Amino acid sequence: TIMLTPMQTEEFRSYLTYTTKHYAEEKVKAGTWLPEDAQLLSKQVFTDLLPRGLETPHHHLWSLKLNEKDIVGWLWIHAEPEHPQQEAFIYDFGLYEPYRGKGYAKQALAALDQAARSMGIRKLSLHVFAHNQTARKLYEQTGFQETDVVMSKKLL
Amino acid sequence: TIMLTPMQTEEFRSYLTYTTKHYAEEKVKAGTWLPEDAQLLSKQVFTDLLPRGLETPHHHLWSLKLNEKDIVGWLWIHAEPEHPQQEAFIYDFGLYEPYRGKGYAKQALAALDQAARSMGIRKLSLHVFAHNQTARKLYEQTGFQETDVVMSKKLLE
Amino acid sequence: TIMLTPMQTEEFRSYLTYTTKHYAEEKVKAGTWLPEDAQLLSKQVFTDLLPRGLETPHHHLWSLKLNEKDIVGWLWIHAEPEHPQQEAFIYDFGLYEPYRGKGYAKQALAALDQAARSMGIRKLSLHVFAHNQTARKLYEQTGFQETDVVMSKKLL
Amino acid sequence: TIMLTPMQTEEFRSYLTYTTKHYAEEKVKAGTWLPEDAQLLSKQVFTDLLPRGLETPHHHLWSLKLNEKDIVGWLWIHAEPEHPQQEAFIYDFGLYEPYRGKGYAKQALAALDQAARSMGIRKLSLHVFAHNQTARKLYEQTGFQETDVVMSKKLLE
Numbered sequence: 025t026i027m028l029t030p031m032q033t034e035e036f037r038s039y040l041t042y043t044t045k046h047y048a049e050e051k052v053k054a055g056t057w058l059p060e061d062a063q064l065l066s067k068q069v070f071t072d073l074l075p076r077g078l079e080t081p082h083h084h085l086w087s088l089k090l091n092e093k094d095i096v097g098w099l100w101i102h103a104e105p106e107h108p109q110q111e112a113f114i115y116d117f118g119l120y121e122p123y124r125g126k127g128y129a130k131q132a133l134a135a136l137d138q139a140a141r142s143m144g145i146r147k148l149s150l151h152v153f154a155h156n157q158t159a160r161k162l163y164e165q166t167g168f169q170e171t172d173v174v175m176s177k178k179l180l
Numbered sequence: 181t182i183m184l185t186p187m188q189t190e191e192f193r194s195y196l197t198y199t200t201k202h203y204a205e206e207k208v209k210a211g212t213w214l215p216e217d218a219q220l221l222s223k224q225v226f227t228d229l230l231p232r233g234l235e236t237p238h239h240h241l242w243s244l245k246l247n248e249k250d251i252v253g254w255l256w257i258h259a260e261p262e263h264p265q266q267e268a269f270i271y272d273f274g275l276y277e278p279y280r281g282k283g284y285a286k287q288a289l290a291a292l293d294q295a296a297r298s299m300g301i302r303k304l305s306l307h308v309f310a311h312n313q314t315a316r317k318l319y320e321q322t323g324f325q326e327t328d329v330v331m332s333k334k335l336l337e
Numbered sequence: 338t339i340m341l342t343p344m345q346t347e348e349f350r351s352y353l354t355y356t357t358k359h360y361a362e363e364k365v366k367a368g369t370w371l372p373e374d375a376q377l378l379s380k381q382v383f384t385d386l387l388p389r390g391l392e393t394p395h396h397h398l399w400s401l402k403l404n405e406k407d408i409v410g411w412l413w414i415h416a417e418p419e420h421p422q423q424e425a426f427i428y429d430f431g432l433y434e435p436y437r438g439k440g441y442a443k444q445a446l447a448a449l450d451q452a453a454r455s456m457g458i459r460k461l462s463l464h465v466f467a468h469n470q471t472a473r474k475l476y477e478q479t480g481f482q483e484t485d486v487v488m489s490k491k492l493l
Numbered sequence: 494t495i496m497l498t499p500m501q502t503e504e505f506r507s508y509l510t511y512t513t514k515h516y517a518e519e520k521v522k523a524g525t526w527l528p529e530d531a532q533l534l535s536k537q538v539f540t541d542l543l544p545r546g547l548e549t550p551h552h553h554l555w556s557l558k559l560n561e562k563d564i565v566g567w568l569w570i571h572a573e574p575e576h577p578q579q580e581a582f583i584y585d586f587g588l589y590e591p592y593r594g595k596g597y598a599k600q601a602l603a604a605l606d607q608a609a610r611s612m613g614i615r616k617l618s619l620h621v622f623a624h625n626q627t628a629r630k631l632y633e634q635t636g637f638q639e640t641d642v643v644m645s646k647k648l649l650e
C-alpha cells in the first residue's frame with residue numbers, strides 16, 4: 025500500500041535539490057532550455073513556486089511511502105484557490121530509481137485520486153514532457169487525457 | 181575522482197533489470213520497437229550479449245563511484261578478441277538520476293579512457309540514440325566522432 | 338544580477354584548492370596555525386567537512402553567477418538536520434578578485450536569504466576571521482550579528 | 494627573497510586551469526574574444542603552447558616563493574632553441590590573490606633577470622593586455638619597453 029505523508033524538513037530539501045536539477049535536465053531533453061542555462065532557470069522556477077518551501081499555501085508536497093523505511097517517491101500538487109472546477113495541478117510525481125518497475129507508480133496514482141477527492145479536489149491537471157513516453161502511457165491508462173500539446177521543429 | 185569497480189553479482193542483477201527496462205524505452209522512443217514488443221526484445225538482446233552474465237568473457241561491467249558511498253553510475257565495455265585496432269565497444273554508460281547535473285559524466289568518461297589504455301584498448305566505439313541529444317554532445321565534447329548514422333521515415337497511411 | 342546554481346565538479350576542484358589555501362593564509366594571519374602547518378591542516382579540515390565531496394549530505398555548494406558567461410563566486414551552506422532553530426551554517430562565501438568590489442556580495446546574501454526561506458531555513462550563522470573586517474562590516478550590514486568571539490594572546 | 498623553483502605537477506594543474514580561465518576573461522574584456530568562445534578558445538591556446546605540459550622543451554614553468562614554503566606566484570618563460578637574439582619570451586607572470594602589493598613582483602622580475610642572465614638570455618620579451626595597467630607600470634620600472642601594439646575600434650555591435 026502506498027501512503028502519502030506530508031514531506032518532512034529533510035525529505036523536502038533533498039527533493040528540492042533533486043527535482044531542481046531534474047526539471048532542468050528534462051527541459052534540456054525537451055529542447056526548450058539550453059544546457060548552460062537549465063540549472064539556473066530551474067532553481068528560479070522552483071524558488072518562485074515555493075517561496076516558503078513547505079509553508080507555501082495551497083501547495084501539498086508528499087513523500088510516497090511503501091512503508092516506514094521505504095520512500096518510493098514523491099507527489100506535489102497545488103490546489104488552486106477556489107478554482108472554478110476545484111482543480112489541482114500536479115507539479116511533480118515520480119518514484120526513485122530503486123523502486124521503479126514494481127508497479128508502485130500506478131498504485132501511487134490511485135492513492136493520489138483517493139487523497140485528492142477526500143480533500144474536495146474534483147479534477148487533476150498535469151504537465152508531462154512528451155519524451156516521457158512511459159509516464160505518458162501510465163497517465164493515460166489511469167484515466168488522464170491530453171488537453172494541450174506543444175510541438176516544435178528545427179529549420180535549415 | 182570517479183572510480184571504476186567491477187560490479188558484484190548484487191549490482192549486476194539490479195543493473196540488468198535497470199538497463200533492460202531502459203533500453204526498451206529507448207528503442208520505442210527511437211521508433212525502432214513497438215511498445216508491446218520493447219520489453220521482451222530488450223531482455224533477449226542483453227541475454228544474448230551476456231550469456232553467463234558477469235562471467236561472459238571479454239565483457240567488463242563497472243560501477244562508477246565518486247567515493248566509497250556515492251555510486252554515480254555504470255560503465256559496460258566489450259573488448260573483442262584480438263581486435264585489429266584493439267578497439268572496445270561501450271555497450272552502456274550513464275549516471276543515476278541523483279548524480280547527474282554535476283559534470284561527473286565527463287569525468288567518468290575520462291576514467292574510461294584511462295582504464296581502456298591501461299588494459300591495451302587503443303580505440304573506443306559506442307552507440308547513441310539520435311534522440312539522446314545531451315549524450316551525443318557529451319561524447320562529441322570528449323573527442324568522440326560520428327562514423328555511422330541510421331535514419332528512418334514513416335510513409336503516409 | 339547574482340543567482341545561485343549547483344556548483345560543478347570541476348569548479349569544486351578549483352574552488353576546494355583556491356579555498357583550502359586561503360583558509361591556511363587566514364589561519365596563519367590569525368596566529369591560530371603556524372605558517373609551516375596551515376597548508377596541511379586546511380586540507381584535513383575541508384576533507385573532514387566534505388567526505389563525499391559535493392555529494393556530502395546536507396551541504397549545499399553553489400556557484401555565484403552574474404551571467405551565463407562566467408561564475409563570479411561561491412557559497413557553501415550546511416543545513417543541520419533537525420536543527421531546533423532551522424538554521425544553516427555558512428561554511429564559505431566569497432567572490433573572485435576580478436568580481437569583487439562591485440556589490441555582488443550583498444546581492445549574493447540576498448539570494449541566500451531567498452534560497453534559505455524556500456528551503457525552510459529560518460536562521461543563518463557563519464564564521465569569519467577577525468582580521469577580515471571587510472566581510473564583518475558587510476555581514477553586519479546584512480543583518481548579521483556577533484554571538485561568539487575567539488581571542489588569543491602570545492605570552493612569550 | 495623571491496626565487497624560482499621548478500613548478501610541481503600539482504601546482505601546474507591548478508595553475509594551468511587558473512591561467513586558462515584568466516586568459517579567457519582578459520580576452521573577453523579586451524573584446525577580442527566572444528564570451529561563448531573564450532573558454533574553449535583559451536584551452537586551445539594553452540594546449541598548443543604546452544603539448545607536453547611541464548615537459549614542453551625550452552619552456553620553463555617556475556613557482557615564485559620567498560622562502561621555500563610560500564608559493565606566492567608563477568613565472569612562465571620560453572627560451573627558443575637558437576634564437577637570433579638569444580631572447581626569452583615571458584608567456585605568463587603573476588602572484589596569487591592572497592599575495593599582492595607586497596612588492597613581490599619587483600623582486601620576482603629581479604630573480605628573472607638573474608636567472609635569465611644565467612641561462613644565456615640576452616633579451617626578454619612579453620605580452621601584456623592593454624587593460625593591465627598595473628603590470629604595464631611594473632614592467633616599465635624594470636626597464637621594459639613597448640615595441641608593438643594591437644588596437645581595435647568597434648563600428649557598431
Ligand SMILES: [Cl-]
Pocket residue numbers: 040041343397
Ligand atoms: Cl540545491
